[PDB]
Amino acid sequence: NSSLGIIVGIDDSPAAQVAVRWAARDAELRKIPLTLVHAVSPEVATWLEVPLPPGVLRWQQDHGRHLIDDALKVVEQASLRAGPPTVHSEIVPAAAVPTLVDMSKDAVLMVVGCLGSGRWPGRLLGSVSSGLLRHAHCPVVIIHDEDSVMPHPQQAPVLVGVDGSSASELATAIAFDEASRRNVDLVALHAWSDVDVSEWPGIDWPATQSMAEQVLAERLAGWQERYPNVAITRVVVRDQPARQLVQRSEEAQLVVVGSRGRGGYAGMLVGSVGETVAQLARTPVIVARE
Amino acid sequence: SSLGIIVGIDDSPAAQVAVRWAARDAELRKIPLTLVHAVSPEVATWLEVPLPPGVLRWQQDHGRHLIDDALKVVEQASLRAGPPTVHSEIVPAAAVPTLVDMSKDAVLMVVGCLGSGRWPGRLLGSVSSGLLRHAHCPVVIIHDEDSVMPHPQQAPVLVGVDGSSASELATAIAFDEASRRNVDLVALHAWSDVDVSEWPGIDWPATQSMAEQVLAERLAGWQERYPNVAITRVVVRDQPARQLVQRSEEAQLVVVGSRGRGGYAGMLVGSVGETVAQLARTPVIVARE
Ligand SMILES: Nc1ncnc2c1ncn2[C@@H]1O[C@H](COP(=O)(O)OP(=O)(O)OP(=O)(O)O)[C@@H](O)[C@H]1O
Ligand SMILES: Nc1ncnc2c1ncn2[C@@H]1O[C@H](COP(=O)(O)OP(=O)(O)OP(=O)(O)O)[C@@H](O)[C@H]1O
Ligand SMILES: Nc1ncnc2c1ncn2[C@@H]1O[C@H](COP(=O)(O)OP(=O)(O)OP(=O)(O)O)[C@@H](O)[C@H]1O
Ligand SMILES: Nc1ncnc2c1ncn2[C@@H]1O[C@H](COP(=O)(O)OP(=O)(O)OP(=O)(O)O)[C@@H](O)[C@H]1O
Ligand SMILES: [Mg+2]
Numbered sequence: 001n002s003s004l005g006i007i008v009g010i011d012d013s014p015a016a017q018v019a020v021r022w023a024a025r026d027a028e029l030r031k032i033p034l035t036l037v038h039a040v041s042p043e044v045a046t047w048l049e050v051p052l053p054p055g056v057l058r059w060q061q062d063h064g065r066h067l068i069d070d071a072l073k074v075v076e077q078a079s080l081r082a083g084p085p086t087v088h089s090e091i092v093p094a095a096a097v098p099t100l101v102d103m104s105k106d107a108v109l110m111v112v113g114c115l116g117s118g119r120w121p122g123r124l125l126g127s128v129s130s131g132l133l134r135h136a137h138c139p140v141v142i143i144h145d146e147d148s149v150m151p152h153p154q155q156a157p158v159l160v161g162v163d164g165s166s167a168s169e170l171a172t173a174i175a176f177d178e179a180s181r182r183n184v185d186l187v188a189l190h191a192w193s194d195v196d197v198s199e200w201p202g203i204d205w206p207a208t209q210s211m212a213e214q215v216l217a218e219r220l221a222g223w224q225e226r227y228p229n230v231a232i233t234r235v236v237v238r239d240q241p242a243r244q245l246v247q248r249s250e251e252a253q254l255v256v257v258g259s260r261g262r263g264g265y266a267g268m269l270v271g272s273v274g275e276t277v278a279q280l281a282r283t284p285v286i287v288a289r290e
Numbered sequence: 291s292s293l294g295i296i297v298g299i300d301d302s303p304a305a306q307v308a309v310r311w312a313a314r315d316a317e318l319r320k321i322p323l324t325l326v327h328a329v330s331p332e333v334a335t336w337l338e339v340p341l342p343p344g345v346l347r348w349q350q351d352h353g354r355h356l357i358d359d360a361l362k363v364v365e366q367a368s369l370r371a372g373p374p375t376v377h378s379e380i381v382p383a384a385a386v387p388t389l390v391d392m393s394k395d396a397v398l399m400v401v402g403c404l405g406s407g408r409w410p411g412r413l414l415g416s417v418s419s420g421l422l423r424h425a426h427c428p429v430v431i432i433h434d435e436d437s438v439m440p441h442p443q444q445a446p447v448l449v450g451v452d453g454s455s456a457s458e459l460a461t462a463i464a465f466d467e468a469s470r471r472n473v474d475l476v477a478l479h480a481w482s483d484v485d486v487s488e489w490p491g492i493d494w495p496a497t498q499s500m501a502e503q504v505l506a507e508r509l510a511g512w513q514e515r516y517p518n519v520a521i522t523r524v525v526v527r528d529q530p531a532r533q534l535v536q537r538s539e540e541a542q543l544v545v546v547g548s549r550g551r552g553g554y555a556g557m558l559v560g561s562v563g564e565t566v567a568q569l570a571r572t573p574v575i576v577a578r579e
């Protein structure tokens with residue numbers, strides 16, 4: 001029903017804080033509810049012959065309430081003026097992924113930090129963001145603890161990766177929708193080849209590039225007509241869409257990609273471009289899920 | 291298991307040391323070694339134009355060169371007579387679907403962590419990642435700085451135990467592997483899957499002692515099946531992934547399950563299983579049923 005509006009998962013981490021800032025702005029901008037969720041699993045998680053103390057389950061509730069507390073304070077600083085219509089807040093006694101995945105059935109956007117409290121130097125995606133990226137029933141927004149969310153009005157355009165797939169169409173819709181609402185420009189990018197064609201002999205790229213830029217323009221005709229107020233900038237590159245998007249994300253305020261594409265295989269939950277852009281991009285990333 | 295040990299080949303440092311490891315293991319178990327390189331002969335494009343038949347021939351020529359190199363690496367890595375059988379296949383399909391299908395007849399599936407498409411930042415390639423989630427047998431992840439050639443290698447085999455059925459499989463291969471290599475085994479258990487540092491009123495020493503007692507109990511039986519492998523039990527507070535990664539520096543092999551006692555329905559690989567696979571400092575076997 002999408003009545004929950006923009007859900008945002010919360011924990012004790014920088015990413016989650018700046019994730020709230022972003023989720024607040026978008027909920028305000030879109031004029032829809034902003035749900036704040038923090039999950040605490042109350043299941044027995046250790047060997048039964050070694051139980052946990054009773055004073056620990058209550059401590060998590062208090063910790064949780066103290067988090068939501070600060071979160072609600074951040075929702076205020078983030079608002080440009082009005083703030084989102086409804087401002088909803090919850091501490092669910094269940095595991096983070098299962099609860100957030102279930103709640104996404106009634107959400108417009110699902111927003112979480114990319115790394116959480118159990119992070120360390122090596123990792124680049126936590127279990128919550130990862131599971132959400134693979135199972136959510138709505139677009140998932142990944143925020144990094146160095147993303148620029150405070151500045152306004154943000155002039156940086158919206159970058160989107162298109163590849164013709166159905167999952168990519170959804171991503172496009174989101175990209176334009178988000179672009180006009182923010183009143184900024186849109187950069188559509190297509191890598192001719194999904195496969196890395198560095199050593200491929202007898203290509204002749206300059207010839208192929210000119211032909212592609214035309215087909216790109218033809219596919220974006222319906223979208224340009226539907227969104228006359230937003231200025232499209234088409235870019236065709238040879239290959240390596242993930243690495244292309246990640247580098248060009250530095251000159252954009254928001255990157256949008258599908259969760260699937262032309263390639264992949266049976267049983268794949270999230271594509272490698274989707275996953276890689278979400279991990280390495282320098283700005284907020286929206287991974288479109290049906 | 292007619293295919294024995296399958297190793298996926300591509301042009302990359304990790305894939306090369308993966309072949310070294312696979313060869314040693316296939317030799318050790320005296321089972322077939324199967325080298326596989328997959329080339330996707332089609333590149334779906336918007337123009338809907340097929341590939342110049344000249345390019346299509348080049349990648350067969352490229353696969354041929356990889357195999358030739360790989361076959362030499364196999365005999366360089368063989369300590370004695372090597373694997374009883376060595377096979378190479380060049381399959382005209384995508385790597386993941388190809389390898390996932392072949393894993394139905396493999397004892398182990400060996401691939402590098404990163405491939406020829408690697409670039410700074412990425413920890414796992416699409417093939418290693420897809421194999422971790424989908425393979426029909428245990429998957430071995432090799433890193434390009436993994437020590438494989440030095441022999442004899444007396445470092446222990448490290449295994450993470452959490453009590454789950456998938457963890458039970460991990461234990462099985464950890465002992466099998468340690469037994470065949472004539473080395474010792476370190477079984478590590480983290481009492482809590484989630485962080486516990488800030489939790490009030492624990493009493494760690496008493497909880498640790500009770501846990502160590504249960505660990506020993508579960509490992510009895512394995513010990514009785516494997517009298518010659520000296521077990522070492524380590525019980526830590528929490529953070530099993532970071533603990534395993536840190537302790538891998540002093541093992542020659544780490545074994546974990548693909549799933550644990552946590553997770554959810556639809557999860558293909560646990561966060562500990564994956565994090566160990568990508569951050570560990572030695573070969574990592576991830577157990578799959
Ligand atoms: N308990 C939770 N409830 C709701 N959302 C959460 C919760 N924990 C984390 N999140 C969200 O997920 C984002 C990433 O946290 P995640 O837990 O996935 O990473 P991590 O803690 O570093 O890794 P891991 O949890 O696997 O040890 C956080 O920034 C936050 O937005
Ligand atoms: N060639 C491309 N050019 C521009 N964007 C792309 C390209 N390929 C994928 N994308 C973006 O990434 C999103 C997810 O596609 P992805 O390729 O990750 O899924 P997939 O093709 O099923 O997986 P894989 O390519 O790893 O086999 C696409 O919907 C699109 O938004
Ligand atoms: N074409 C292939 N055929 C067989 N095995 C492969 C093939 N490509 C990669 N592998 C195996 O997977 C390991 C990791 O490579 P992978 O391709 O997953 O990483 P990458 O190339 O950096 O990622 P990506 O292909 O998604 O850009 C390689 O070391 C190799 O063992
Ligand atoms: N607490 C632990 N102590 C020792 N080993 C562990 C522990 N947790 C996980 N492992 C190792 O990791 C393997 C995979 O389990 P993992 O925890 O990754 O899956 P899961 O619990 O189902 O998923 P998740 O932990 O993210 O909810 C286990 O089989 C075990 O070998
Ligand atoms: Mg966490």
Ligand SMILES: [Mg+2]
Binds near residue numbers: 194261262263273
């Ligand atoms: Mg793709």
Ligand SMILES: [Mg+2]
Binds near residue numbers: 300
């Ligand atoms: Mg590759």
Ligand SMILES: [Mg+2]
Binds near residue numbers: 483551552553560562
């Ligand atoms: Mg676990």
